[PDB]
Design a protein around this ligand. Structure first.
Ligand SMILES: [Cl-]
Ligand SMILES: [Cl-]
Ligand SMILES: [Cl-]
Lengths: 449, 433
């Protein structure tokens, strides 16, 4: 009957994030128990699906405050839902507006493949609304965009940049496409995090989606659509993961704490086991889910690595030194800092530490994001920035023809990510870094996914 | 308005189509019969999903997503090596996608578990089955009968299939409402799902599976719907109350808005139908069709007496209520509506079961749109014999629905109604969907 003292190198992460990012990622997603391959479609195991559940609960609650109703439309065409053609059957009068719908979807197809990120398999939501006028639709587009900011920032501890897509990168049926953009600094790649579209009257004209207004004048509806996918999980993994494995923001971890007993003598086993159970009770009585790993066949050291790999935010260790001192050792996953905590203070310190882990994960990620943006004047400064795994903020004329030319001259190509909502001042005579006719606004450009 | 034009008792299938479309539950895409679950239908699914998730989580079942039982079980040995890995408990909420220009219920739930022994597995099978009873009975106000399927009607891979059966008395047809299967070690042997037990002995896992679909919604509609349209148990209606003004014209609005705020402040969602271009009669029918549990009517006299009139959807009874008593009376009424819907459906279910001792009583019961509870020897070969004979006499077949968990006494000398060797247990038989 075998005792396992040492977690073998091969069962941990054998590639370093910075040195071999793609293999590092592959290893983390399987070894942390997020996903499992069947044969390259993958199963979302509970640790991944739990993250989706948490963001789904938050988003549902928030969209319901905006009177959005969930629904389910099963017919799709190549991916988009057959829906707008039905809207004339439901809308006659301003009293029928706004129409506000959302659905939670699941799709799998043959892969073409980085799980969560470049995949034909995902869970998502998409919302669709129709309003009596432009201002109400555009307000809603930006309200939803801020909810995406919160999904990322409050749940995944991922900072995003809000912006408007360039004409070449926006959805063809949209008047404008707003976006949340994320950036993975370790490989220099931007990735679109969520989208929120003002569709104007385009589909109303196609399907005769018209209503009688309050003045008895016929008008087109103004539409919106918006979506966010399990790509969000990938972004989170890539943002916080380290060389020991997965790191989970506490808000999307099922177990907040793992309790590990330390003892080598049978005379100590009962007191250790009992104290560990006291701590498990204290936390669970307080609605803090946790796991007490009391397996006899694995050493404490093995268990440390086992649960770090799984991304548990806090580990509490209990050894004989701790019984003697009425304490325990609390270890944070994010930065591996340890402290001794009195038994009576474990609840409060754990609560405070879960909040601080989230803050630290976010603030460190935001620093990396901010440090990844180089503001440039000229195309000659661009390649050095790209090669430093950066994206660039450049004054740009926003001429659609230039997007394919920028791509072509700089997969190694950089593309317009978004024109950020937050604009630095534009100096009086600033020229486009490409054109160079007068520059309109600053645009972010980068290599992408 | 065009309301419901066919009577439930007279043309059931036409009634049903009119109710599901007119009430805004579904919209058909086209003659394929593919359809949209509109918010009124999806809201029901949401409510039961919330309930079920909460309860299965108390049993440590975790949600997951396997792309679409062979993918699934072939992967289980990768996760199970010792007793420490058990029990494995998974659930999935599934959605179907139909691609328009590609070669080919839209929502359902399926769970799967694996356990160290028979006792633990079977206990979960029955715990889940009671959660399905509660899904039906607490949220949908639909009574069900728990039982075990016959050998001929169980899932072929199961050691036994437990079931919740419902009956629609207006058309005399039973319907399987949910199922929960003990799979034994059948698939474990097939996919080599073994573990090392506490004593270092290799054992097979004991598995269960269980599911329920949007058919549950259809069952609810068939059960409580009436000739005016949909009837919603309050727990699965987005709006609990509609407020309808009856023409003041300024004081009326203000008064209706006061009631709206009282209810909404107490977290009771409601709608104040203040549309100027429709009559109150129009509005009454509009909201009845849509299944809203309670209407509150406010007219001039009610202003004068500081009252209003509360009207129940289920029985159309009215009562006069003081303004300051509206919140409490509304809360009590929503409870009482659910209780009445359930009790009247339970009475119809009870009255649909004829207990028989011989085959010569069966066709009379079937032709009266009943089910029969009969003493049966349970021999699989009799199932098709009984199907054929009841079909023949109809000119339709009845089949075994379930062997109820709640068994009446079996006299020591009772014969099977068909065979009649010694009878074992009572079995429910009926026509089915
Ligand atoms: Cl297609
Ligand atoms: Cl937390
Ligand atoms: Cl079955």
């Amino acid at each position: 009957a075998h005792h396992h003292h040492h977690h073998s190198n091969i069962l941990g992460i054998t590639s370093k994030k910075i040195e071999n990012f793609s293999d590092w990622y592959t290893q983390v997603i399987v070894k942390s128990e997020l996903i499992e391959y069947y044969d390259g479609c993958y199963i979302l195991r509970p640790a991944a699906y739990y993250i989706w559940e948490c963001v789904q609960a938050f988003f549902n609650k928030e969209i319901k405050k905006l009177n959005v109703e969930n629904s389910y439309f099963p017919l799709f065409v190549t991916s988009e839902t057959i829906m707008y053609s039905v809207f004339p059957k439901w809308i006659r009068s301003y009293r029928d507006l706004p129409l506000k719908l959302n659905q939670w979807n699941t799709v799998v197809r043959w892969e073409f493949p980085t799980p969560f990120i470049r995949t034909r398999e995902f869970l998502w939501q998409e919302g669709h609304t129709a309003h009596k006028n432009e201002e109400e639709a555009v307000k809603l587009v930006f309200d939803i965009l801020d909810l995406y900011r919160r999904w990322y920032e409050e749940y995944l501890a991922v900072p995003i940049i809000k912006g408007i897509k360039s004409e070449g990168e926006k959805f063809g049926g949209a008047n404008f496409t707003s976006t949340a953009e994320a950036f993975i600094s370790e490989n220099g790649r931007a990735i679109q995090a969520a989208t929120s579209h003002y569709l104007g009257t385009n589909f109303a004209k196609m399907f005769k989606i018209e209503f009688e207004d309050e003045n008895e004048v016929k008008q087109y509806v103004h539409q919106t659509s918006w979506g966010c996918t399990t790509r969000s999980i990938g972004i989170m993994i890539m943002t916080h993961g380290d060389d020991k494995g997965l790191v989970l923001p506490p808000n999307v971890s099922k177990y907040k704490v793992v309790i590990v007993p330390i003892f080598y003598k049978t005379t100590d086993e009962n007191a250790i086991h009992s104290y560990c159970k006291d701590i498990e009770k204290i936390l669970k009585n307080a609605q803090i889910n946790c796991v007490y790993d009391d397996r006899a066949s694995y050493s404490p050291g093995y268990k440390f690595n086992h649960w770090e790999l799984r991304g548990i935010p806090i580990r509490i260790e209990v050894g004989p030194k701790d019984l003697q001192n009425n304490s325990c050792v609390i270890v944070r996953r994010d930065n591996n800092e340890k402290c001794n905590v009195k038994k009576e203070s474990v609840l409060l310190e754990t609560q405070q530490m879960l909040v601080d882990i989230h803050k630290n994960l976010f603030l460190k990620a935001k620093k990396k994001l901010d440090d990844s943006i180089v503001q440039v004047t000229s195309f000659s400064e661009v390649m050095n920035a790209l090669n430093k795994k950066k994206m660039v903020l450049a004054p740009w004329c926003e001429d659609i023809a230039t997007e394919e030319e920028i791509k072509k001259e700089t997969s190694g190509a950089m593309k317009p990510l978004c024109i950020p909502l937050d604009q630095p001042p534009m100096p009086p005579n600033m020229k486009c870094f490409w054109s160079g006719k007068p520059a309109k606004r600053w645009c972010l450009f980068g290599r992408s996914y």
